[PDB]
Each structure stands twice: as C-alpha cells, then as structure tokens.
Design a protein around this ligand. Structure first.
Ligand SMILES: Nc1ncnc2c1ncn2[C@@H]1O[C@@H]2COP(=O)(O)O[C@H]2[C@H]1O
Ligand SMILES: Nc1ncnc2c1ncn2[C@@H]1O[C@@H]2COP(=O)(O)O[C@H]2[C@H]1O
Ligand SMILES: Nc1ncnc2c1ncn2[C@@H]1O[C@@H]2COP(=O)(O)O[C@H]2[C@H]1O
Ligand SMILES: Nc1ncnc2c1ncn2[C@@H]1O[C@@H]2COP(=O)(O)O[C@H]2[C@H]1O
Lengths: 383, 380
C-alpha cells in the first residue's frame, strides 16, 4: 500500500537498462556463439537447442545448425523423436553408431528426407532448473574425427565411436551459461506478467473508489477501452447464469438499441471457453471454422457479421470462471464503408483481419479489471 | 529470449495504469473506508488492520477506524497470538480479567484507550499465509445516549458468531488491496533481478576485461549509484573457512584482507546468509571489533556498512558484498588517520532500506560474473 511510488521508480530503472538496446538479439547471438563453441569442443557436426512451447505442445529450435553456417528453425511435436524422449523423461540419451538401426529413429528418418541431413550418432541432454523443470533440450549430432581431409563427405568424417561420457561432462562447462540466458529471460516474462496482473487489480480498485457509475456502466468502460486499444469493432462481456448453465450479455448496436443475447455453455466460441476455461483466438474468416454455426445465426438476427474473434476467460480469486470477454472483428487498416446486412454472408473488407498473440497479452489487463469489478463493485458501493 | 520487446510493451501498459495517479493515497483511503464500514456494521468502537513486518518482527497498523500508527512486537498480545497461530480469537467481557491482556493493559496506560471486548481475525491467502490481522474492539450497544462514556455504551455480551461471519463480506475486498499491492512489489523486485541478469549477459558479451576487472567494474558502479566511498566483494576460501578480498586504497596500492568466517560483519553475514545494514556510527555496534582493527591497519575509518550475501544457482553462498561509508553530500577534507577514532564529517551518513533493494541487482551481477565471465570471454 505504501511502497507504490518507490517501486514505480525501480520499474523506470529497469526500462532504462533494457529499452532500445536490442536484448532479443544480444541474447540470441550469445546463445548462438555458446552453442557453436560447445559443438566445436565436443566434436559435433551440428548442435541444436530446443525449447518447449507447452501451449502448442511442440519443441522448436532457438538455435540450430544449418548448411553453410546459415541456420533454420526445426519444429516437432513434443512427444516425438529422441528430443521428445528427453523432454518427457529428462534423461541423457546417448545414441551410438548407427542411429538408423535403432527403432526410435523412425521419426528422424522421415525428417531427413525433407532436410537432407543424416544423423549417425547423437548426444541429447536435458537442461533442468534447480527444481527439475525443463529449460531446454540440447542435441549434439554426429561426433567427428579430430582429423579429416578438408573436402571429406559427412560419412567419412564421422567417428564411429560416437559421443562419450567425457563429452557429456565437458558440456557442463557451458550448461550454466545457456541456462542463464534462457532462465533470465523467462523470469523477466513471468515477473512482467504478475506485475501487470497486480497493477490491473490496483487500477480496478481506483476505478471503483472514484466512480459514481453502476456495475453495468463500469464494465462498459473497461470493454470500450479494450476495444479501442486492440482496434476491434466491438467488445462484449458475457456473464454466467449458473442455475440455467448459460451465458448472457447486453450488446449495443449501430442504431441505439439494447438487445440481450443468451447462449448455452458449450455452444459457440463463448460457450466453448466458458466450459473449458481456456482462450480461443479465431482468425479471419471465422465462418470457415467448424464451430461457427452459432455466430452465423446470431449475426443474421443482429444484422452483423463476425469475421474474427478473441475469446478469453475471466476468473475469481479462487480460479472459478465468472465470465468471458470477446473482442469482435479486428479492423483492417484503412477507410471502408459501413457493413450492410443485405450482403450477408459476404465478409466486408473492413473486417479482413485477425487478432494476434500481442492482442491476447494486452487484453489480459482488461479481463482482470472486469473480474475485480464483478466481484467487488457491490461491496464498494455499500461503502 | 524472443519475447523481451513484447513484455517491455506490457511494462509500459503497467506504467500507464499506475503513474501520476497518487495510488498510495487511493489504496490507503479505500482501505480506511472499508475498515470504517466493517466496524460500523459489526458494531465495534474501533477497528484496526495490522500488517507484519517480517524483518523487524513487528505488527504495525496500516489503518485504524473509529488515528495513529500502533506498533507492537509480533509475538505480543492477542494480535500476536493471531499472527502466530492463525485462528480467530473472541474475547468476552472483561478482557482485563484474562491473563493474556497484560500487554494491552500496559499499552493502555500510554494510549488511554480501554479494551473490554475483542474480536481478532486472521486474514489469510489461499496458501494459508498471513495477509493481516483485523482487530475489532468494544462491541457497542445499538443505542446509547449521545454523550455516554465508553463503559456505558459497551455491550457486555461482546462480539457474536454472526459478527464473525459478517466479516467475511468485507474480507475479500481487504485482501484485494493488500495482496495486489504486495504482488506488485514482489513482481517488480523479481523483474529487476531478471533484468540485471540479462544486463550482465550484455556486459560480458561486449567485454575485454578479465574476471578481476569485471568484478571491480560491478562494484565500482554499485558504489557510484548509491554514493558509497568504497565497495568490496569478499570471496570464500571454502577450505580455511575464511573470506578474502583485494582492496585498493586512495593512493594507488593493493592489499589483501583476510577474515575468519564468523568474525566481523562480513564473516557474520557469510555464516548466516542474511544481510546486515549497520547505520552510523558503526563503532557503537557490539560486533565492530574487527572493523576497528582493520581500519587502524589501513589508515581508514568504517562508519556505515551494507553487507549482503551473494548466491550461485542453488542458493549456496559464493560471496559477500559491502558498500562502505555512505557519503554525506558536500565538500569535505580527506580523512586523516591521525584523528582515529573520530568519525569524519564526510562519512556522517547511513544506507537506508532503499539502498538495500537497489543493491540486489549489483549482487546478482557479481554472482553472474563469478560463474560466467571466464566462459563468455573464451567464446568471444
Ligand atoms: N541442426 C539440425 N540439422 C538437421 N537435423 C537436425 C538438427 N537438429 C536435430 N536434427 C534432427 O531432427 C530430428 C528430430 O527427431 P530426433 O530428435 O529423433 O532426431 C533429430 C535429428 O536427427
Ligand atoms: N458485441 C457484439 N455485437 C454483435 N455480436 C456479438 C457481439 N459479441 C458477440 N457477438 C456474437 O455473439 C456470438 C455468440 O456466439 P460465438 O461466441 O460463437 O460468436 C459470437 C458473436 O458472433
Ligand atoms: N485502534 C486502536 N486504538 C487503541 N487501541 C488499540 C487499537 N487497536 C488495538 N488496540 C489495542 O492495542 C493492543 C495490542 O495488544 P492486544 O492485541 O492484546 O490488544 C490491543 C488493543 O487493546
Ligand atoms: N574497500 C575497503 N577498504 C577499506 N576497508 C574495507 C573495505 N571493505 C571492507 N573494509 C573493512 O574490512 C572489514 C572486515 O570486517 P567487517 O566486515 O567487520 O568490517 C569491514 C570494513 O571495516
């Protein structure tokens, strides 16, 4: 309560040390240099660092050796390959010559047909936090003989004895520095997210104390601000009717009309999010999505057209879902005439656009402010 | 690695929500209003919200309704009991007949307020951590004549089970204000920590300094920002059970200092793992014997000191930093060792707890350099 201003000065100093300095590049370039040196010292032809996108269940390479020292991004399902084995069970996997005689290599053999790279031997290592969380998977490919002709083909340059126990321990000279880059950035992301959530709650307290508006009008202001920042045509807060197992809301049209909408939980994108507690971001054109039947019927009834949609859950203090926000129709940049319902179901060019991952992160502060208001506005009014 | 720019834009969103809006006053005034309403509805003469300062081990009032700041040892009184055992305490009339009231009876001689009944409730998080102690005093009769004395307007049947339940209508709102602000404070400090690690990666990637000079650069920046005369990084001889460091004197000299772990402020902090902030004048402190001897040997004088632990990956101690002598702003004569033990005016100042929080970023940068500077240079 009494440290806000001082902590804001600390935030400003954090911005001074990071803003405009190209830290994504500094961090990625250093990671690349470490990986190169790690591979050189362990005698690997190629060295890859995989990260885990747990939202999409995929391992993707933040650093990965390519042909002619120009690198590409490898992306696989998090359960597949030796990389997936290391991600799941968090053991070192050492594959001796020849990897292709191992039945675990089937996935890799299919990927070779595309990449043109041939893996004979491998050392794959989990990078773990102190708690044992997966930070990354480091994969070293094709142990090399220390001396080969400079024009030698891969099959002649490989060392049939593969990677050794001494190589695995040598990797520990580098492991801490790799962890530092990956863990420092991750920790920055999480702290920034928790800081934002806390700030959004504080801002909601300020709104409720200073306003002489209803709950209804306070929630409208939050959704209208969200809509403006994200360049959405409309926005909506759906509330739960627990008794009937339904969502409801009151929309306002281009007319001067107040219409109530009601959808069963489980039906439509709002209903799906209410049932699952998990966001959905539906890109243009929403009408091509297999779950769009509900939108099609409501659009025709309202003289509107839903083309893109960001649907996110709103929670309690104790993880109970109490609402669902929607941003409706990311606006394409430019000037266009208003939508005319006589053209249905044709999508107007003005809504040929989609919400992205940035819109999702920026919307979260508005979701939190809505939730705080729903839970606390009645007590705040009494006071 | 690939989300730094997006997250920095989130930091700017956060600043736009909070900057220049007088939030310390908005939050405190709302907390005050909710406390007033809570006391009115439960019929308490007075209502207090205590917070726990963990480092000083004190309970202190952020709000009082029915106003001064009350401050007690964290283990004393009914408030202390609720902070420790985390259960509701309902005291019937008359509180003073209860042995547990002795502390309050002594506080009463000072404040002049007389407590007859009480309901003290723990406010807890999901995990069972203490957020606050809410203490309601002196249940009132629903009607008393306009100018009735306190003894005449108290209800001698005290607070009810229903009063306890009615409090839960206000508890969530109180939690919101206290927890949201706390979460912002902790997230901000953890964000600076991670930012300082990233900054170290930048420094070590673009550096041509060896380990010794890298560590000196970190400590020199630390003393510049917090206006200390000198600064020091002690390393551990984990073998002789000793600390060592190489100081540079105002002259152009190098000198090794050795302290047994356990002795001196550096040694105490190494054996315990807890920071110490020794205010002016450090020579008045019980544990200052080592500083006094070392000062005479160096022709120096230690007047204030901020001594902090430095850890590796898994929270094992790899060093101790010191900022030495917060400098008084102005222009003063150089310290002359012939004046010993007189403290010079240039060092008549102290480090505050804001310096402690800012210094953590340099502590982390030193720890990162110890573990990574040599490898980074090899790759470069
Ligand atoms: N840098 C790289 N270049 C080409 N192929 C790679 C690279 N890194 C990993 N791979 C291959 O990608 C495969 C994914 O499945 P595996 O992990 O079983 O085996 C992996 C390697 O054979
Ligand atoms: N503010 C709004 N104005 C008009 N239609 C809306 C608005 N918000 C949501 N909708 C529509 O309401 C529909 C409910 O089901 P869906 O979530 O599938 O798709 C939703 C949109 O098509
Ligand atoms: N707002 C207040 N005004 C006067 N006295 C108070 C107030 N709040 C708490 N106290 C007294 O401070 C005492 C501290 O010890 P106890 O918790 O035993 O009992 C507490 C009350 O008697
Ligand atoms: N850079 C420095 N220059 C001179 N004295 C120092 C320096 N750093 C630490 N000291 C002194 O070294 C002493 C070691 O024991 P203490 O930590 O008790 O107190 C410390 C200070 O008095």
């Amino acid at each position: 309560v009494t440290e806000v201003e001082q902590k804001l000065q600390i935030v400003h100093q954090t911005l001074s040390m990071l803003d405009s300095h190209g830290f994504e590049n500094i961090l990625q370039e250093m990671l690349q240099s470490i990986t190169l040196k790690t591979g050189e010292l362990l005698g690997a032809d190629r060295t890859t660092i995989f990260l885990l996108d747990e939202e999409k269940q995929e391992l993707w390479s933040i650093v990965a050796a390519g042909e002619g020292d120009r690198s590409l991004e490898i992306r696989i399902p998090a359960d597949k390959g030796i990389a997936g084995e290391v991600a799941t069970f968090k053991q070192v996997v050492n594959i001796p010559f020849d990897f292709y005689h191992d039945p675990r290599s089937i996935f890799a053999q299919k990927q070779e047909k595309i990449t043109g790279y041939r893996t004979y031997t491998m050392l794959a290592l989990p990078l773990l936090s102190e708690q044992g969380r997966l930070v990354a998977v480091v994969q070293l490919l094709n142990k090399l003989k220390p001396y080969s002709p400079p024009d030698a083909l891969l099959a002649e340059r490989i060392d049939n004895q593969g990677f050794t126990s001494a190589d695995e321990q040598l990797f520990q000279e580098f492991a801490p520095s790799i962890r530092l880059i990956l863990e420092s950035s991750r920790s920055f992301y999480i702290a920034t997210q928790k800081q934002r959530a806390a700030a959004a709650m504080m801002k909601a307290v300020k709104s409720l104390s200073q306003s002489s508006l209803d709950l209804e009008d306070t929630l409208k202001r939050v959704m209208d601000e969200a809509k403006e920042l994200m360049n959405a045509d409309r926005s909506t807060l759906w509330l739960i009717d627990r008794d009937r197992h339904e969502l409801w809301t009151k929309i306002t049209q281009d007319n001067g009309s107040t219409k109530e909408l009601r959808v069963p939980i489980g039906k439509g994108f709002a209903g799906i999010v209410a049932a699952s507690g998990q966001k959905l971001n539906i890109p243009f054109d929403l009408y091509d999505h297999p779950d769009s039947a509900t939108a099609k019927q409501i659009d025709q009834q309202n003289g509107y057209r839903t083309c893109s949609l960001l649907c996110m859950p709103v929670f309690n203090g104790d993880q109970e879902l109490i609402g669902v926000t929607q941003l409706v129709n990311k606006k394409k940049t430019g000037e266009f005439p208003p939508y005319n319902p006589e053209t249905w179901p044709i999508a107007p060019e003005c809504f040929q656009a989609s919400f992205d991952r940035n819109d999702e992160e920026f919307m979260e502060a508005f979701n939190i402010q809505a939730g705080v208001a729903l839970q606390n506005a009645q007590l705040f009014a009494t006071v």
